[PDB]
Subunit: 367 residues, 3 copies
């Protein structure tokens, strides 16, 4: 059954820890500003001190209140609790002072957790887990860190377990539900109702070193369905006329659960998606677009396109439906043991391979 081929995947209700996970976008943090996030059940407080983004547990060691209720900073590099003034050093999380009791004997005897942080491609990543952090590149799809590119994205909260997000991203026939998105005609896309594996090389598992993932060779080893038929009659057909754009030549997912749609939502872009667990029933959905650039002008041109088109016409215009689609599955999988009652079909094998690889390679399980 399910609990037999991918047990650790089913156990990772709260995600795979001992992996890097995005928390926010670098531009969300100005010097001295605070941003509260919840990752894999942990409340984290982010801030920028002396130009560097720091991550510390969003909970005071005294009476456990979150600093985010009223975040205070009286000296860059520290955070002070709004309740009794306990002050912590962001570099090591140690209690270095108590504003309400100078010289208190608890100073230097207490500390809270701080997390390793690395900002890459404008994204703030945080290492969650007890192990010492490994290279960030091991937890990202290949190409994400390309130096000759620029990235722009957004994040939002989705009311479903993170796994439903990943499986909604790495699903080659769910695209049927996007057939009426204004982005399809909006960007003159030749968009099929689904992709069906045409041979045994349709899916490739990368399990040699890191990163590890599953790749769907949509453009070479799949058959796209542009027509829907019911009992011998064509009841639906995609629009294939004139000059149309080709997207999604390949789609892949990589541990700890990051999607890569290449190219998408336009031939000149690549779309990455993360589904970071917030709680057992919620996740933070990140959408990041990657554009190849040759200099500052291309960067500026991309930023403008993102603001005027890509973001709202695609990240919302195309993907908004994916949000309620995920949430529509929450009860079944989250409450009714859908993991053992689902009935899959051929195209879902890529998802099965992902669950198997994830169950075998996820560095740490958080239930």
């Amino acid at each position: 059954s399910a609990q037999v081929k991918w047990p650790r995947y089913l156990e990772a209700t709260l995600g795979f820890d001992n992996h890097w996970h995005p928390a926010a976008f670098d531009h969300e943090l100005a010097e001295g500003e605070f941003v509260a996030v919840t990752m894999l059940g942990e409340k984290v407080l982010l801030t920028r001190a002396k130009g560097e983004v720091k991550a510390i547990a969003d909970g005071c060691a005294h009476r456990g209140v979150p600093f985010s209720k009223e975040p205070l900073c009286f000296k860059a590099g520290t955070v002070s609790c709004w309740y009794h003034g306990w002050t912590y050093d962001l570099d090591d999380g140690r209690l270095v002072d108590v504003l309400t009791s100078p010289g208190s004997p608890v100073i230097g005897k207490i500390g809270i957790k701080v997390y390793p942080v690395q900002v890459a491609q404008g994204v703030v990543f945080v290492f969650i887990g007890d192990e010492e952090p490994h290279a960030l590149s091991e937890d990202l799809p290949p190409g994400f860190l390309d130096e000759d590119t620029h990235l722009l994205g957004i994040r939002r909260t989705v009311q479903s377990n993170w796994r439903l997000g990943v499986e909604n991203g790495f699903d080659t026939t769910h695209i049927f539900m996007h057939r009426n998105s204004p982005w399809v005609s909006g960007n003159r896309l030749a968009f099929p109702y689904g992709f069906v594996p045409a041979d045994r090389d349709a899916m490739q598992v990368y399990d040699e070193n890191w990163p590890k993932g599953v790749l769907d060779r949509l453009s070479e080893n799949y058959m796209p369905v542009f027509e829907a038929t019911l009992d011998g009659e064509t009841v639906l057909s995609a629009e294939l006329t004139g000059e149309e754009k080709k997207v999604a030549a390949q789609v892949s997912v990589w541990l700890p659960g990051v999607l890569k749609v290449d190219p998408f939502p336009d031939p000149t872009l690549i779309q990455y998606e993360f589904y970071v667990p917030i709680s057992e029933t919620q996740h933070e959905y990140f959408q990041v677009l990657q554009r190849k650039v040759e200099g500052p002008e291309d960067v500026k041109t991309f930023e403008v396109e993102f603001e005027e088109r890509w973001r709202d016409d695609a990240l919302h215009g195309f993907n908004d439906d994916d949000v309620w689609a995920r949430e529509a599955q929450q009860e079944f999988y989250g409450e009714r043991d859908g993991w053992s009652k689902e009935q899959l079909f051929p195209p879902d094998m890529c998802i099965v391979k992902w669950r198997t690889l994830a169950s075998e390679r996820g560095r740490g399980v958080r239930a």
Copy 2:
């Protein structure tokens, strides 16, 4: 105690299954239209295909999503899931196609549940349970199916266990709370504060074949109370003056839990009530009025009176208070084990007879 005289009634938190239950009104469904309902914990999707109302489980066999999120029909007699296009035959619930993968090998190897449906007197009834359906008439009070009558009603959701609804309907002294309803003077009713059993033939149990139920002979074996006294002083008195109408000559309840008030809310009408479980804490309250008719003209006259008077002046004007009355009992009975702590009095014996009959005859228990 309770768990000893009517144990199966106490166990039937989610209702008695293997019985017919109303789901909606026939006029709520036009050809191709969809109506989602939840009955005894089961989500059901109703539609009209080729003129006939069909009932199918509102949950896809693939990833369990409900079709009601975005119901699709590309061929009358089928329903297609909005997610990956799995299409089902409404007659048998079998998967007959997959819009995103024509000829997929799962076709014909999967199916979901469909329910027997029977429309009578403008009401859509659905058979819930594993057993094969028996005659509809066995689950309705006598007279409901009278051919020389026409029926009109409404349904609404109530936040209480269904048993609290049934017992609020089949309660001869709770009417005290309706004394100030504008319908009392609105329809010149001689309406008492309560009916107290006057002899041993006040209540009669019908437990021979079907339908089965309990009847209160209010007009001949009960004493109506038109005056409320306290410490020897008359503190309240009903208005008995001029030409007033007499209603509620008899009130009865029949398995699986259907009320019959004869006559009510007017001498020319009979009122039926159903309290179909939605969940363990909610039920769908149906109010159906029956009028004897001699032809099309009488039907039209009834439909007009219903729209202009009966529905809002009585079904709401009189009964609305019954809704919060039921919900006011939810915590006690639903959370504080009120079933074993309640303290009944003589008039409640008709309810005791009903719980006993239901516990012994309910065809199926759904906990």
Copy 3:
């Protein structure tokens, strides 16, 4: 650990019963008026009958509905249920009549709980518990019942366990969070960021007879902190310029959990606080100000300044922040076993003494 030092305090999630607790203010009840309250998990109905405030269980013995849904009284000294008319004697809670069934055999054979009530200093106190009530003075801080004073207050609901309320009131360094309240400059207060115990006599435990409690001698055995320093630099300093008022010379808490701030929020006043449990996660916060008076004129002057100044400028302007401060602790202590994970420091010892005294002297534990 905590479970070993103050076990009964940790068990009293729903408060200490067999103690008097405030329910409302006397002026909230006019003759024949009703006020519903929930104390230590019990729903209570208050009313004034023949000039006297009465307290009866807000739940009918018949089908458990609360009278508060629609409180009825047809004879001063009784309460009648809105559902079937069961009527109870407020003096002994016995069923003395049934409006819907005169002479019903259940009359005199049924009864509900009534509570001892005592009004003092404009406050309605109710005795919760199974024991016979003891003197009210045993559950109040010394000075509360002073005959040459007048009291005025307000109450509100707070979303946190009651113990978090008490410990927030009896905390000498949490005042840091109040530094920016408009009441500080509003009443020209010389207000420190915290009070730190300066010697061994800083806290005194009164455990000889009743009332019992812990007293902090702030003005004589504590060191007030008017500056906040971080890594050697003054980052915050209170305003100490000329003619300012001195308050909080002493603060104390007494069983079952009543605070006394002397003087506060002004030198001419004393502030009392109660934190009566509503449920396991909620409490009713009472704030009562005491002013010494010499006659009806002083009473009038106090009532006027309470309305024009004390209430909104202090009870709200100063204390409102204490509400979310308490609630910010609810998850940690209420759901994440904060009682054993908290890490206290020297000033918290007064709270530790209070927990110990309460665990040893609370008359009754309600979990």
